[PDB]
Chain A
Amino acid sequence: ETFNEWFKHMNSVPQKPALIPQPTFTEKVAHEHKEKKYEMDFGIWKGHLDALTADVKEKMYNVLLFVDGGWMVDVREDAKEDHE
């Protein structure tokens, strides 16, 4: 569930501004505002992506390196005959 959330957060990054040739006075201001908002949008997306990656790494480490045996390893060796 953490890996799926990290993938969904990384696959929805903020796009860049739509560049247009020969702009006008209002178009230049709109492009400047879009570039100023992108400077924070990309930073927030990078921070959220790094947080999701750090959470997924810890989750994978906890799932792999398990105390007392390991992943899908029975610590008790005095059960019945459960070969299947």
Chain B
Amino acid sequence: IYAKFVSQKISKTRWRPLPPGSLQTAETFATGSWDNEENYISLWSIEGDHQLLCDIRHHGDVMDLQFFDQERIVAASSTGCVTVFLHHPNNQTLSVNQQWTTAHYHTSSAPCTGVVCNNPEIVTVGEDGRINLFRADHKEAVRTIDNADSSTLHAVTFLRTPEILTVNSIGQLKIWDFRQQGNEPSQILSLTGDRVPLHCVDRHPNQQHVVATGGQDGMLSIWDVRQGTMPVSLLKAHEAEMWEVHFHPSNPEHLFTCSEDGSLWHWDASSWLSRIEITSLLPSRSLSVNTLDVLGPCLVCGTDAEAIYVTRHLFS
């Protein structure tokens, strides 16, 4: 593993998707700067080293970033503008094709929380309780669920098409559908009380009912969508709030999670619904981390101390 300085607080880190049937590892990865007066969304490309390819200025703090395809990258700003940074695959340029400025607003400016990436749609959520479902080459959204909850969303995970599951700030996980009538959720799964606040939500690649989430206490909760309304396993890990948490797409036993204390633990259960081995990839000293990406053998993450750790040999 090796770190690289960029003089910018990275708020998101997502690796680029490979082609169909490719046998190589992930070489390109995107990043998102925040907590500054001029946020930018550059894209790096690989002791190891990495150089910057293209960059573009982004208005507002990039709260979430996800790649929709090989040349499309959806980004969630802090002003409610869900601008999809469609990267040009010809001259290798970062431009903007489609953008939705009225995706999250208060009738003020509500900041966009999480944003899912599924071809060919665009599921996102904001602080105003609006679950929009945009698509490609569309001016308006196809479905907008205006939730009347008192809390605010922080993350949104999609299990099956087209029913996603978001997490509020009260530790509850509500499941909604884009083709359903009304603005109420079908299922509601919360924890013990309303003091804990979930910030990350991700489902398994093989199991559509199992999903892992992280509260504001550092305990990784693995709940199910057809096993009551509570968590099946609640195991503590860090001491601060859980930043991002996502498992690997190749193997479902390995799963990484980031916290607000400065520790990138990588759990290895080689089932989550049932002795798990945890190994921290980064040490102390460094500040808290924002997000972390995993694409088989490579691992890219971003810290708050203007650092970006990259390791293309996680199992070698």
A interface residues with partner B (beta carbon < 8 Å): 14, 26, 29, 33-34, 36-45
Contact = CB atoms under 8 A, between A and B. Distances in A.
Interface residues of B, number: 15
A44 B25 contact: no
A60 to B, nearest CB: 24
9 contacts: A26-B24, A36-B49, A36-B312, A38-B48, A39-B48, A40-B49, A41-B2, A42-B47, A44-B47
Contacts of B311: 37
A36 B4 contact: no
A36 B48 contact: yes
Contacts of A45: 47
B-side interface mostly: loop
B3 interface: yes
Contact of A40 (B4, B25, B313): B4
A43 B1 CA distance: 12
Nearest to A38: B47
Contacts of A37: 2, 47-49, 311-313
Contacts of B310: 40
A29 B25 CA distance: 9
- For B3, B4, B47, B48, the residue with the greatest tally of chain A CB atoms inside 10 Å of its CB is B47
Contacts of B312: 33, 36-37
B234 interface: no
A33 B2 CA distance: 12
B23 interface: yes
A50 to B, nearest CB: 15
A39 B47 contact: yes
In this complex, the member of A29, A34, A37, A43 whose beta carbon has the largest number of chain B beta carbons within 10 angstroms is A37
A24 to B, nearest CB: 12
Interface in B293-313: 310-313
B57 interface: no
Contact of B23 (A26, A33, A40, A42): A26
Nearest to B297: A33
Nearest to B50: A36
B206 to A, nearest CB: 28
B47 A29 contact: no
A26 B23 CA distance: 9
Contacts of B2: 37, 39-41, 43-44
B47 A33 contact: no
B24 A43 contact: no
A70 B73 CA distance: 65
A44 B311 CA distance: 14
B48 A33 contact: yes
A30 B50 CA distance: 15
Interface in B28-85: 46-50
A41 B2 CA distance: 6
Contacts of B25: 33
Contacts of B50: 36
A40 B3 contact: yes
Given A26-B24, A40-B49, A44-B2, 20 more contacts: A29-B24, A33-B312, A33-B313, A36-B50, A37-B47, A37-B48, A37-B49, A37-B311, A37-B312, A37-B313, A38-B47, A38-B48, A39-B47, A39-B49, A40-B4, A40-B47, A42-B47, A43-B2, A44-B3, A45-B47
